[PDB]
Ligand binder design. Structure first.
Ligand SMILES: COc1cc(-c2cncc(-c3ccc(C4CCN(C)CC4)cc3)c2C)cc(OC)c1OC
Ligand SMILES: COc1cc(-c2cncc(-c3ccc(C4CCN(C)CC4)cc3)c2C)cc(OC)c1OC
Ligand SMILES: COc1cc(-c2cncc(-c3ccc(C4CCN(C)CC4)cc3)c2C)cc(OC)c1OC
Length: 287
């Protein structure tokens, strides 16, 4: 039995503090290879521990292929190998692309579907999982118009890293340090907040009556680039600001319904927020 492990790294499609992602080739097929920085080894360990616990398989979860640790002279090399989505991240896609009603709904319902799959405990199955870093850069666009959720490096599991989430997307109870850290439902409610921000980013790019908004990240109008923890706490907790809903949305039945959904993801009180399952149901009754 020959075990062909060679992956050809062809082009770098992302670089950050986390490390790099490459388009690679295995046996003639594209794969995505995440090479971790020493800085973020704990993200590789957590994603690997999760997949060693439960082999997630869902059309709206980035598909796992392999976790590799390789001994080097003076270091350990850590790779995560996944399915490759050539259209790139939702963040990337929304910069130039506008959406119609069908494509907007298909994107956001596919995300809700992936998120509900993470959140739900299945007996027999899977533990319940909270993501803890949901954002448009951690969502990939598939050729079929659905998305998938990536990066379980901060995920938490329930049955019975010093990395923290992206500050721009942190829920109020994270910023004001009131989150009940011993309560699994707390982490689901943090994901729902972040989902609502992603819903807003997508809805802005849906055309209605010949109008569309430019791509902006959540809170673009009230915080700097690379906002501090304090910048975010003042906006979200002290002033209790929420992203703007443009007037033009209220002429479109889809965007009107999506604005109501966003509102119900953004309550200050975490336990008032909708569940991923209720978001899916609401999205299936829109249009
Ligand atoms: C170790 O490393 C890597 C391996 C591979 C890879 C390459 N060919 C064949 C395999 C294979 C799968 C499954 C079995 C089964 C069948 C027989 N029996 C009932 C249980 C065992 C055997 C062999 C693998 C796993 C790819 C890699 O990258 C994509 C690897 O590195 C990350
Ligand atoms: C890691 O990833 C990929 C792996 C492979 C791959 C390569 N050799 C052998 C296998 C295999 C054969 C047989 C069994 C089972 C089936 C019967 N059962 C009762 C026990 C044994 C499992 C595994 C696979 C799956 C192909 C891939 O792509 C086409 C992979 O994806 C990149
Ligand atoms: C978020 O997280 C992970 C993501 C991925 C991943 C999987 N498919 C495709 C991509 C990708 C491809 C291409 C572009 C751009 C670059 C060129 N041009 C400007 C248009 C297209 C962007 C993105 C990625 C980054 C893999 C991961 O692990 C292996 C990730 O980490 C879990």
């Amino acid at each position: 039995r020959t075990v062909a492990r060679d992956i050809t790294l062809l082009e770098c499609v992302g670089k950050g503090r986390y490390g790099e992602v490459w388009r690679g080739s295995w046996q003639g097929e594209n794969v995505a290879v995440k090479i971790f920085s020493s800085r973020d080894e704990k993200s590789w360990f957590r994603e690997t521990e999760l997949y060693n616990t439960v082999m997630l398989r869902h059309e709206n979860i980035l598909g796992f292929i392999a976790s590799d640790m390789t001994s080097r002279h003076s270091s350990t090399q850590l790779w995560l190998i996944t399915h490759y989505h050539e259209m790139g991240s939702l963040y990337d896609y929304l910069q130039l692309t506008t959406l119609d009603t069908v494509s907007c709904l298909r994107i956001v319902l596919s995300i809700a579907s992936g998120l509900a799959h993470l959140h739900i405990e299945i007996f027999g199955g899977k533990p319940a999982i909270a993501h803890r870093d949901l954002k448009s850069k951690n969502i990939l666009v598939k050729k079929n118009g659905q998305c998938c959720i990536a990066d379980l490096g901060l995920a938490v599991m329930h049955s019975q890293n010093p990395r923290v989430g992206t500050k721009r997307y942190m829920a109020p109870e994270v910023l004001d340090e009131t989150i009940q850290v011993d309560c699994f439902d707390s982490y689901k409610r943090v994901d729902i907040w972040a989902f609502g921000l992603v819903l807003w980013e997508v809805a802005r790019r849906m055309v209605s009556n010949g109008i569309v908004e430019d791509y902006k990240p959540p809170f673009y109008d009230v915080v700097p680039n690379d906002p501090s923890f304090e910048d975010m706490r003042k906006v979200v907790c002290v002033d209790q600001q929420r992203p703007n809903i443009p007037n033009r949305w209220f002429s479109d039945p889809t965007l009107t319904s999506l604005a109501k959904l966003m509102k119900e993801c953004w309550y200050q009180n975490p336990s008032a927020r909708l569940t991923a399952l209720r978001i899916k149901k609401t999205l299936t009754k829109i249009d």
